[PDB]
Amino acid sequence: MKKKPFSILFMGIEDYATKGQKGRSDSLIVVTLDPKNKTMKMLSIPRDTRVQLASKTKINAAYSKGGKDETVETVENFLQIPIDKYVTVDFDGFKDVINEVGGIDVDVPEMHLNGEEALAYADFGRNDRQKQILNALIDRMSDKIAEKASENVETNIRITEGLALQQIYSGFTSKKIDTLSITGSDLYLGPNNTYYFEPDATNLEKVRKTLQEHLDYT
Protein backbone atom coordinates (compact mmCIF):
# COMPACT_ATOMS: atom_id res chain seq x y z
CA MET A 1 0.00 0.00 0.00
CA LYS A 2 1.31 3.41 -0.99
CA LYS A 3 1.57 5.89 1.89
CA LYS A 4 -0.25 8.77 0.20
CA PRO A 5 -2.79 10.48 2.43
CA PHE A 6 -6.47 9.69 1.83
CA SER A 7 -9.95 10.21 3.24
CA ILE A 8 -12.64 7.91 4.59
CA LEU A 9 -16.35 8.70 4.98
CA PHE A 10 -18.09 6.62 7.65
CA MET A 11 -21.87 6.66 7.09
CA GLY A 12 -24.25 5.13 9.63
CA ILE A 13 -27.69 3.94 8.52
CA GLU A 14 -30.41 2.09 10.14
CA ASP A 15 -31.66 0.44 6.96
CA TYR A 16 -29.95 -0.91 3.84
CA ALA A 17 -33.67 -0.88 3.00
CA THR A 18 -33.94 2.88 2.72
CA LYS A 19 -36.53 4.18 0.24
CA GLY A 20 -38.74 7.20 0.91
CA GLN A 21 -37.91 10.29 2.94
CA LYS A 22 -37.14 7.80 5.73
CA GLY A 23 -33.85 6.32 4.46
CA ARG A 24 -31.65 9.12 5.84
CA SER A 25 -28.19 8.74 7.41
CA ASP A 26 -27.73 9.12 11.16
CA SER A 27 -23.96 9.54 11.36
CA LEU A 28 -21.49 11.19 9.05
CA ILE A 29 -17.85 11.06 10.15
CA VAL A 30 -14.83 11.84 8.00
CA VAL A 31 -11.30 10.69 8.85
CA THR A 32 -8.22 11.83 6.99
CA LEU A 33 -5.04 9.75 7.06
CA ASP A 34 -1.43 10.52 6.32
CA PRO A 35 0.28 7.12 6.72
CA LYS A 36 3.84 8.29 5.89
CA ASN A 37 3.51 10.50 8.96
CA LYS A 38 1.25 8.32 11.09
CA THR A 39 -1.29 11.16 11.36
CA MET A 40 -5.04 11.42 11.46
CA LYS A 41 -7.76 14.04 11.66
CA MET A 42 -11.42 13.49 12.22
CA LEU A 43 -14.60 15.41 11.56
CA SER A 44 -18.26 15.10 12.41
CA ILE A 45 -20.95 16.43 10.14
CA PRO A 46 -24.19 17.11 12.02
CA ARG A 47 -27.14 15.41 10.28
CA ASP A 48 -29.06 18.64 9.91
CA THR A 49 -26.26 20.62 8.40
CA ARG A 50 -27.74 22.81 5.73
CA VAL A 51 -26.03 22.05 2.42
CA GLN A 52 -26.44 22.05 -1.29
CA LEU A 53 -27.07 18.35 -2.14
CA ALA A 54 -24.88 16.94 -4.87
CA SER A 55 -31.62 23.89 -5.93
CA LYS A 56 -32.88 24.43 -2.40
CA THR A 57 -30.68 23.78 0.56
CA LYS A 58 -31.64 20.89 2.76
CA ILE A 59 -30.07 18.86 5.49
CA ASN A 60 -27.48 16.20 4.50
CA ALA A 61 -30.23 13.56 3.94
CA ALA A 62 -28.56 12.84 0.57
CA TYR A 63 -28.64 9.10 1.24
CA SER A 64 -32.43 9.08 1.09
CA LYS A 65 -32.45 10.61 -2.38
CA GLY A 66 -29.51 8.82 -3.94
CA GLY A 67 -27.93 6.52 -1.39
CA LYS A 68 -24.22 6.30 -0.58
CA ASP A 69 -22.99 7.90 -3.85
CA GLU A 70 -25.10 10.99 -3.19
CA THR A 71 -23.94 11.37 0.40
CA VAL A 72 -20.38 10.96 -0.75
CA GLU A 73 -20.60 13.57 -3.50
CA THR A 74 -22.54 16.00 -1.22
CA VAL A 75 -19.78 15.59 1.40
CA GLU A 76 -16.96 16.04 -1.14
CA ASN A 77 -18.78 19.22 -2.25
CA PHE A 78 -19.22 20.38 1.30
CA LEU A 79 -15.66 19.79 2.42
CA GLN A 80 -13.92 20.51 -0.87
CA ILE A 81 -11.89 17.35 -0.56
CA PRO A 82 -12.01 14.06 -2.40
CA ILE A 83 -13.57 11.15 -0.51
CA ASP A 84 -11.38 8.14 -1.30
CA LYS A 85 -12.84 5.43 0.86
CA TYR A 86 -16.25 4.94 2.36
CA VAL A 87 -17.91 2.83 5.05
CA THR A 88 -21.65 2.38 5.48
CA VAL A 89 -22.97 0.39 8.39
CA ASP A 90 -26.49 -0.60 9.60
CA PHE A 91 -27.90 -0.74 13.17
CA ASP A 92 -27.34 -4.47 13.43
CA GLY A 93 -24.07 -4.57 11.48
CA PHE A 94 -22.86 -1.87 13.83
CA LYS A 95 -23.76 -3.71 17.04
CA ASP A 96 -22.32 -6.80 15.38
CA VAL A 97 -18.90 -5.42 14.43
CA ILE A 98 -18.52 -4.16 18.01
CA ASN A 99 -19.17 -7.59 19.51
CA GLU A 100 -16.56 -8.79 17.01
CA VAL A 101 -13.50 -6.76 17.99
CA GLY A 102 -14.43 -7.49 21.59
CA GLY A 103 -16.53 -4.50 22.48
CA ILE A 104 -14.61 -1.61 23.99
CA ASP A 105 -14.60 0.97 26.75
CA VAL A 106 -15.53 4.64 26.80
CA ASP A 107 -15.88 7.69 29.18
CA VAL A 108 -19.64 7.85 29.91
CA PRO A 109 -21.12 10.74 31.98
CA GLU A 110 -15.05 4.79 32.48
CA MET A 111 -16.62 1.54 31.30
CA HIS A 112 -16.90 -1.31 28.77
CA LEU A 113 -19.95 -1.68 26.52
CA ASN A 114 -21.79 -4.19 24.30
CA GLY A 115 -23.04 -3.69 20.75
CA GLU A 116 -26.48 -3.03 22.14
CA GLU A 117 -25.07 -0.58 24.65
CA ALA A 118 -22.77 1.55 22.51
CA LEU A 119 -25.33 1.13 19.73
CA ALA A 120 -27.89 2.65 22.10
CA TYR A 121 -25.19 4.77 23.67
CA ALA A 122 -26.06 6.78 20.54
CA ASP A 123 -27.60 16.73 17.48
CA PHE A 124 -24.04 17.60 18.61
CA GLY A 125 -24.39 15.65 21.85
CA ARG A 126 -25.11 12.44 19.94
CA ASN A 127 -22.18 13.56 17.76
CA ASP A 128 -19.63 13.61 20.58
CA ARG A 129 -20.59 10.05 21.64
CA GLN A 130 -20.21 8.71 18.10
CA LYS A 131 -16.65 9.96 17.73
CA GLN A 132 -16.18 8.56 21.20
CA ILE A 133 -17.16 5.19 19.78
CA LEU A 134 -15.05 5.46 16.67
CA ASN A 135 -12.16 6.71 18.82
CA ALA A 136 -12.57 3.65 21.06
CA LEU A 137 -12.67 1.34 18.08
CA ILE A 138 -9.50 2.94 16.71
CA ASP A 139 -7.75 2.48 20.10
CA ARG A 140 -9.19 -1.02 20.37
CA MET A 141 -6.42 -1.85 17.94
CA SER A 142 -3.51 0.54 17.46
CA ASP A 143 -6.95 -10.81 10.65
CA LYS A 144 -10.40 -12.44 10.45
CA ILE A 145 -12.12 -9.74 12.47
CA ALA A 146 -11.76 -7.87 9.19
CA GLU A 147 -13.12 -10.53 6.79
CA LYS A 148 -16.17 -10.72 9.09
CA ALA A 149 -16.78 -7.09 10.09
CA SER A 150 -16.13 -6.23 6.45
CA GLU A 151 -18.77 -8.38 4.76
CA ASN A 152 -21.22 -6.58 7.08
CA VAL A 153 -20.72 -3.07 5.67
CA GLU A 154 -20.79 -1.32 2.33
CA THR A 155 -17.14 -0.33 1.75
CA ASN A 156 -14.37 -0.15 -0.78
CA ILE A 157 -11.58 -0.63 1.70
CA ARG A 158 -9.93 -3.88 0.64
CA ILE A 159 -8.50 -6.40 3.13
CA THR A 160 -4.84 -5.82 2.24
CA GLU A 161 -5.32 -2.08 2.82
CA GLY A 162 -7.16 -2.48 6.14
CA LEU A 163 -4.38 -4.71 7.49
CA ALA A 164 -1.74 -2.47 5.99
CA LEU A 165 -3.39 0.30 8.00
CA GLN A 166 -3.62 -1.19 11.50
CA GLN A 167 0.00 -2.20 10.88
CA ILE A 168 1.20 1.36 9.95
CA TYR A 169 -0.97 2.82 12.78
CA SER A 170 -0.05 0.34 15.55
CA GLY A 171 2.70 2.70 16.62
CA PHE A 172 2.13 6.31 17.73
CA THR A 173 -1.67 6.20 17.64
CA SER A 174 -4.30 6.54 20.36
CA LYS A 175 -5.77 9.85 21.60
CA LYS A 176 -3.78 11.90 19.08
CA ILE A 177 -6.31 12.40 16.27
CA ASP A 178 -6.63 16.09 15.44
CA THR A 179 -10.45 16.32 15.84
CA LEU A 180 -12.00 19.22 13.89
CA SER A 181 -15.48 20.58 14.17
CA ILE A 182 -18.12 22.21 12.02
CA THR A 183 -19.37 25.22 13.97
CA GLY A 184 -22.68 26.80 13.21
CA SER A 185 -25.87 28.03 14.77
CA ASP A 186 -29.51 27.10 14.88
CA LEU A 187 -31.84 28.13 12.10
CA TYR A 188 -35.52 27.25 12.11
CA LEU A 189 -37.60 27.54 8.99
CA GLY A 190 -41.34 27.44 8.37
CA PRO A 191 -44.35 27.24 10.78
CA ASN A 192 -43.86 23.61 11.87
CA ASN A 193 -40.32 24.62 12.84
CA THR A 194 -38.22 22.19 10.83
CA TYR A 195 -34.72 22.52 12.30
CA TYR A 196 -31.52 23.11 10.38
CA PHE A 197 -27.90 23.43 11.42
CA GLU A 198 -26.39 26.37 9.56
CA PRO A 199 -22.62 25.96 9.52
CA ASP A 200 -20.45 29.00 10.18
CA ALA A 201 -18.94 30.04 6.89
CA THR A 202 -15.69 31.09 8.43
CA ASN A 203 -15.00 27.87 10.30
CA LEU A 204 -16.05 25.75 7.30
CA GLU A 205 -13.30 27.42 5.26
CA LYS A 206 -10.72 26.75 7.96
CA VAL A 207 -11.83 23.13 8.23
CA ARG A 208 -11.42 22.84 4.39
CA LYS A 209 -7.90 24.27 4.37
CA THR A 210 -6.89 22.07 7.30
CA LEU A 211 -8.05 18.81 5.63
CA GLN A 212 -6.84 19.93 2.21
CA GLU A 213 -3.35 20.42 3.61
CA HIS A 214 -3.47 17.04 5.42
CA LEU A 215 -4.43 15.26 2.16
CA ASP A 216 -1.76 17.28 0.33
CA TYR A 217 -4.58 18.52 -1.88
CA THR A 218 -5.52 21.86 -3.56
mmCIF file of C-alpha atoms in Angstrom:
data_model
loop_
_atom_site.group_PDB
_atom_site.id
_atom_site.type_symbol
_atom_site.label_atom_id
_atom_site.label_comp_id
_atom_site.label_asym_id
_atom_site.label_seq_id
_atom_site.Cartn_x
_atom_site.Cartn_y
_atom_site.Cartn_z
ATOM 1 C CA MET A 1 0.000 0.000 0.000
ATOM 2 C CA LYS A 2 1.306 3.414 -0.988
ATOM 3 C CA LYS A 3 1.568 5.889 1.890
ATOM 4 C CA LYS A 4 -0.253 8.773 0.197
ATOM 5 C CA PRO A 5 -2.790 10.479 2.427
ATOM 6 C CA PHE A 6 -6.469 9.692 1.832
ATOM 7 C CA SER A 7 -9.945 10.210 3.239
ATOM 8 C CA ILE A 8 -12.641 7.911 4.588
ATOM 9 C CA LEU A 9 -16.351 8.703 4.977
ATOM 10 C CA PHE A 10 -18.093 6.617 7.652
ATOM 11 C CA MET A 11 -21.870 6.664 7.087
ATOM 12 C CA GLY A 12 -24.255 5.133 9.632
ATOM 13 C CA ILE A 13 -27.687 3.944 8.518
ATOM 14 C CA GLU A 14 -30.408 2.092 10.141
ATOM 15 C CA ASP A 15 -31.664 0.443 6.960
ATOM 16 C CA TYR A 16 -29.951 -0.908 3.845
ATOM 17 C CA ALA A 17 -33.670 -0.882 2.998
ATOM 18 C CA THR A 18 -33.939 2.883 2.721
ATOM 19 C CA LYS A 19 -36.529 4.176 0.240
ATOM 20 C CA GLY A 20 -38.740 7.197 0.910
ATOM 21 C CA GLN A 21 -37.908 10.287 2.940
ATOM 22 C CA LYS A 22 -37.136 7.800 5.728
ATOM 23 C CA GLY A 23 -33.847 6.319 4.462
ATOM 24 C CA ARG A 24 -31.645 9.119 5.844
ATOM 25 C CA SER A 25 -28.194 8.745 7.407
ATOM 26 C CA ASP A 26 -27.726 9.120 11.161
ATOM 27 C CA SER A 27 -23.964 9.544 11.363
ATOM 28 C CA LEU A 28 -21.492 11.189 9.046
ATOM 29 C CA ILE A 29 -17.853 11.057 10.151
ATOM 30 C CA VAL A 30 -14.827 11.839 7.999
ATOM 31 C CA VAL A 31 -11.303 10.692 8.852
ATOM 32 C CA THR A 32 -8.216 11.827 6.990
ATOM 33 C CA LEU A 33 -5.036 9.748 7.059
ATOM 34 C CA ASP A 34 -1.427 10.519 6.321
ATOM 35 C CA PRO A 35 0.282 7.117 6.722
ATOM 36 C CA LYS A 36 3.841 8.292 5.894
ATOM 37 C CA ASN A 37 3.508 10.497 8.959
ATOM 38 C CA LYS A 38 1.254 8.315 11.095
ATOM 39 C CA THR A 39 -1.286 11.159 11.355
ATOM 40 C CA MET A 40 -5.042 11.419 11.456
ATOM 41 C CA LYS A 41 -7.757 14.036 11.664
ATOM 42 C CA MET A 42 -11.419 13.488 12.216
ATOM 43 C CA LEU A 43 -14.596 15.415 11.564
ATOM 44 C CA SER A 44 -18.259 15.100 12.406
ATOM 45 C CA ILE A 45 -20.951 16.435 10.140
ATOM 46 C CA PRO A 46 -24.190 17.109 12.016
ATOM 47 C CA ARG A 47 -27.141 15.405 10.279
ATOM 48 C CA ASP A 48 -29.057 18.644 9.908
ATOM 49 C CA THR A 49 -26.265 20.620 8.400
ATOM 50 C CA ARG A 50 -27.741 22.812 5.734
ATOM 51 C CA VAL A 51 -26.031 22.053 2.418
ATOM 52 C CA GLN A 52 -26.437 22.045 -1.290
ATOM 53 C CA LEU A 53 -27.075 18.348 -2.138
ATOM 54 C CA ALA A 54 -24.877 16.941 -4.870
ATOM 55 C CA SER A 55 -31.618 23.893 -5.929
ATOM 56 C CA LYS A 56 -32.880 24.431 -2.395
ATOM 57 C CA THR A 57 -30.685 23.784 0.559
ATOM 58 C CA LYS A 58 -31.636 20.886 2.757
ATOM 59 C CA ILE A 59 -30.071 18.856 5.495
ATOM 60 C CA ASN A 60 -27.479 16.205 4.502
ATOM 61 C CA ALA A 61 -30.230 13.560 3.940
ATOM 62 C CA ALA A 62 -28.561 12.837 0.570
ATOM 63 C CA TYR A 63 -28.639 9.104 1.243
ATOM 64 C CA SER A 64 -32.427 9.084 1.085
ATOM 65 C CA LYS A 65 -32.447 10.605 -2.376
ATOM 66 C CA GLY A 66 -29.514 8.817 -3.939
ATOM 67 C CA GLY A 67 -27.926 6.519 -1.386
ATOM 68 C CA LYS A 68 -24.221 6.298 -0.583
ATOM 69 C CA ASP A 69 -22.993 7.897 -3.855
ATOM 70 C CA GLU A 70 -25.098 10.992 -3.188
ATOM 71 C CA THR A 71 -23.939 11.366 0.402
ATOM 72 C CA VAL A 72 -20.376 10.955 -0.748
ATOM 73 C CA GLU A 73 -20.604 13.570 -3.499
ATOM 74 C CA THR A 74 -22.544 15.996 -1.225
ATOM 75 C CA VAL A 75 -19.784 15.594 1.401
ATOM 76 C CA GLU A 76 -16.958 16.045 -1.140
ATOM 77 C CA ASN A 77 -18.782 19.218 -2.248
ATOM 78 C CA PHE A 78 -19.219 20.384 1.298
ATOM 79 C CA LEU A 79 -15.658 19.793 2.425
ATOM 80 C CA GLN A 80 -13.917 20.513 -0.869
ATOM 81 C CA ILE A 81 -11.886 17.352 -0.564
ATOM 82 C CA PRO A 82 -12.009 14.056 -2.403
ATOM 83 C CA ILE A 83 -13.568 11.154 -0.513
ATOM 84 C CA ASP A 84 -11.379 8.143 -1.300
ATOM 85 C CA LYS A 85 -12.839 5.426 0.865
ATOM 86 C CA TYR A 86 -16.253 4.941 2.361
ATOM 87 C CA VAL A 87 -17.908 2.832 5.050
ATOM 88 C CA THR A 88 -21.649 2.377 5.482
ATOM 89 C CA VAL A 89 -22.969 0.388 8.389
ATOM 90 C CA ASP A 90 -26.495 -0.601 9.603
ATOM 91 C CA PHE A 91 -27.898 -0.737 13.174
ATOM 92 C CA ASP A 92 -27.337 -4.470 13.432
ATOM 93 C CA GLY A 93 -24.068 -4.574 11.483
ATOM 94 C CA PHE A 94 -22.862 -1.869 13.830
ATOM 95 C CA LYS A 95 -23.764 -3.705 17.042
ATOM 96 C CA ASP A 96 -22.318 -6.796 15.384
ATOM 97 C CA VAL A 97 -18.899 -5.421 14.427
ATOM 98 C CA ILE A 98 -18.522 -4.158 18.014
ATOM 99 C CA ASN A 99 -19.166 -7.586 19.513
ATOM 100 C CA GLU A 100 -16.557 -8.786 17.013
ATOM 101 C CA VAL A 101 -13.502 -6.756 17.992
ATOM 102 C CA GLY A 102 -14.433 -7.495 21.593
ATOM 103 C CA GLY A 103 -16.526 -4.501 22.484
ATOM 104 C CA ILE A 104 -14.610 -1.612 23.994
ATOM 105 C CA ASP A 105 -14.602 0.968 26.748
ATOM 106 C CA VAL A 106 -15.530 4.642 26.798
ATOM 107 C CA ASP A 107 -15.880 7.690 29.176
ATOM 108 C CA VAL A 108 -19.639 7.851 29.913
ATOM 109 C CA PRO A 109 -21.115 10.739 31.983
ATOM 110 C CA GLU A 110 -15.050 4.794 32.476
ATOM 111 C CA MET A 111 -16.622 1.536 31.299
ATOM 112 C CA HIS A 112 -16.898 -1.315 28.767
ATOM 113 C CA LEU A 113 -19.946 -1.680 26.515
ATOM 114 C CA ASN A 114 -21.787 -4.194 24.296
ATOM 115 C CA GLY A 115 -23.041 -3.694 20.746
ATOM 116 C CA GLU A 116 -26.485 -3.031 22.144
ATOM 117 C CA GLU A 117 -25.072 -0.580 24.654
ATOM 118 C CA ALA A 118 -22.771 1.550 22.505
ATOM 119 C CA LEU A 119 -25.329 1.125 19.732
ATOM 120 C CA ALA A 120 -27.892 2.652 22.100
ATOM 121 C CA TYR A 121 -25.194 4.771 23.668
ATOM 122 C CA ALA A 122 -26.063 6.783 20.536
ATOM 123 C CA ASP A 123 -27.595 16.732 17.484
ATOM 124 C CA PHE A 124 -24.041 17.597 18.612
ATOM 125 C CA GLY A 125 -24.393 15.655 21.846
ATOM 126 C CA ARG A 126 -25.111 12.442 19.937
ATOM 127 C CA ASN A 127 -22.179 13.555 17.761
ATOM 128 C CA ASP A 128 -19.629 13.607 20.578
ATOM 129 C CA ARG A 129 -20.588 10.051 21.640
ATOM 130 C CA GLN A 130 -20.215 8.713 18.099
ATOM 131 C CA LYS A 131 -16.654 9.962 17.732
ATOM 132 C CA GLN A 132 -16.179 8.557 21.204
ATOM 133 C CA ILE A 133 -17.158 5.190 19.776
ATOM 134 C CA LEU A 134 -15.049 5.458 16.669
ATOM 135 C CA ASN A 135 -12.162 6.714 18.816
ATOM 136 C CA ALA A 136 -12.572 3.646 21.056
ATOM 137 C CA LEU A 137 -12.673 1.337 18.080
ATOM 138 C CA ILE A 138 -9.500 2.937 16.706
ATOM 139 C CA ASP A 139 -7.749 2.483 20.096
ATOM 140 C CA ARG A 140 -9.194 -1.024 20.371
ATOM 141 C CA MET A 141 -6.415 -1.847 17.941
ATOM 142 C CA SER A 142 -3.507 0.540 17.461
ATOM 143 C CA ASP A 143 -6.949 -10.813 10.647
ATOM 144 C CA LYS A 144 -10.397 -12.437 10.448
ATOM 145 C CA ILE A 145 -12.122 -9.742 12.468
ATOM 146 C CA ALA A 146 -11.757 -7.869 9.190
ATOM 147 C CA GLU A 147 -13.120 -10.527 6.790
ATOM 148 C CA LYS A 148 -16.167 -10.724 9.091
ATOM 149 C CA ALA A 149 -16.779 -7.086 10.087
ATOM 150 C CA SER A 150 -16.128 -6.226 6.451
ATOM 151 C CA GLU A 151 -18.769 -8.379 4.755
ATOM 152 C CA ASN A 152 -21.221 -6.584 7.082
ATOM 153 C CA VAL A 153 -20.717 -3.068 5.671
ATOM 154 C CA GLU A 154 -20.791 -1.320 2.327
ATOM 155 C CA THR A 155 -17.144 -0.334 1.752
ATOM 156 C CA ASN A 156 -14.369 -0.147 -0.783
ATOM 157 C CA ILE A 157 -11.585 -0.625 1.702
ATOM 158 C CA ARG A 158 -9.925 -3.883 0.644
ATOM 159 C CA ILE A 159 -8.496 -6.403 3.127
ATOM 160 C CA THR A 160 -4.841 -5.816 2.236
ATOM 161 C CA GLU A 161 -5.315 -2.078 2.820
ATOM 162 C CA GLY A 162 -7.157 -2.480 6.145
ATOM 163 C CA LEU A 163 -4.378 -4.714 7.486
ATOM 164 C CA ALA A 164 -1.738 -2.472 5.994
ATOM 165 C CA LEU A 165 -3.387 0.303 7.997
ATOM 166 C CA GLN A 166 -3.618 -1.188 11.500
ATOM 167 C CA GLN A 167 -0.001 -2.202 10.882
ATOM 168 C CA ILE A 168 1.200 1.356 9.951
ATOM 169 C CA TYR A 169 -0.974 2.825 12.776
ATOM 170 C CA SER A 170 -0.054 0.342 15.545
ATOM 171 C CA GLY A 171 2.704 2.702 16.623
ATOM 172 C CA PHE A 172 2.130 6.313 17.731
ATOM 173 C CA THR A 173 -1.667 6.197 17.637
ATOM 174 C CA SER A 174 -4.302 6.539 20.356
ATOM 175 C CA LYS A 175 -5.771 9.850 21.595
ATOM 176 C CA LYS A 176 -3.783 11.899 19.077
ATOM 177 C CA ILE A 177 -6.306 12.400 16.268
ATOM 178 C CA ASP A 178 -6.627 16.086 15.439
ATOM 179 C CA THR A 179 -10.447 16.320 15.842
ATOM 180 C CA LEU A 180 -11.999 19.221 13.894
ATOM 181 C CA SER A 181 -15.482 20.581 14.174
ATOM 182 C CA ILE A 182 -18.122 22.213 12.022
ATOM 183 C CA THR A 183 -19.368 25.219 13.968
ATOM 184 C CA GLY A 184 -22.684 26.802 13.208
ATOM 185 C CA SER A 185 -25.869 28.030 14.766
ATOM 186 C CA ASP A 186 -29.508 27.097 14.885
ATOM 187 C CA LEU A 187 -31.845 28.130 12.097
ATOM 188 C CA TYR A 188 -35.519 27.252 12.109
ATOM 189 C CA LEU A 189 -37.603 27.539 8.988
ATOM 190 C CA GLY A 190 -41.344 27.439 8.366
ATOM 191 C CA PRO A 191 -44.352 27.237 10.778
ATOM 192 C CA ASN A 192 -43.860 23.615 11.869
ATOM 193 C CA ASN A 193 -40.322 24.620 12.843
ATOM 194 C CA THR A 194 -38.216 22.186 10.833
ATOM 195 C CA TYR A 195 -34.723 22.520 12.301
ATOM 196 C CA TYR A 196 -31.523 23.108 10.383
ATOM 197 C CA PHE A 197 -27.904 23.431 11.417
ATOM 198 C CA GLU A 198 -26.392 26.374 9.561
ATOM 199 C CA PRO A 199 -22.621 25.963 9.522
ATOM 200 C CA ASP A 200 -20.446 29.002 10.178
ATOM 201 C CA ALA A 201 -18.943 30.036 6.888
ATOM 202 C CA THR A 202 -15.694 31.091 8.433
ATOM 203 C CA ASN A 203 -15.002 27.869 10.303
ATOM 204 C CA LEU A 204 -16.053 25.748 7.303
ATOM 205 C CA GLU A 205 -13.303 27.419 5.261
ATOM 206 C CA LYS A 206 -10.719 26.746 7.960
ATOM 207 C CA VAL A 207 -11.831 23.134 8.234
ATOM 208 C CA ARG A 208 -11.421 22.841 4.394
ATOM 209 C CA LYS A 209 -7.902 24.269 4.374
ATOM 210 C CA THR A 210 -6.888 22.065 7.299
ATOM 211 C CA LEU A 211 -8.055 18.810 5.631
ATOM 212 C CA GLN A 212 -6.839 19.934 2.209
ATOM 213 C CA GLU A 213 -3.354 20.416 3.612
ATOM 214 C CA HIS A 214 -3.467 17.041 5.423
ATOM 215 C CA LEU A 215 -4.428 15.265 2.164
ATOM 216 C CA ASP A 216 -1.759 17.281 0.334
ATOM 217 C CA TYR A 217 -4.585 18.521 -1.877
ATOM 218 C CA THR A 218 -5.523 21.857 -3.564
#
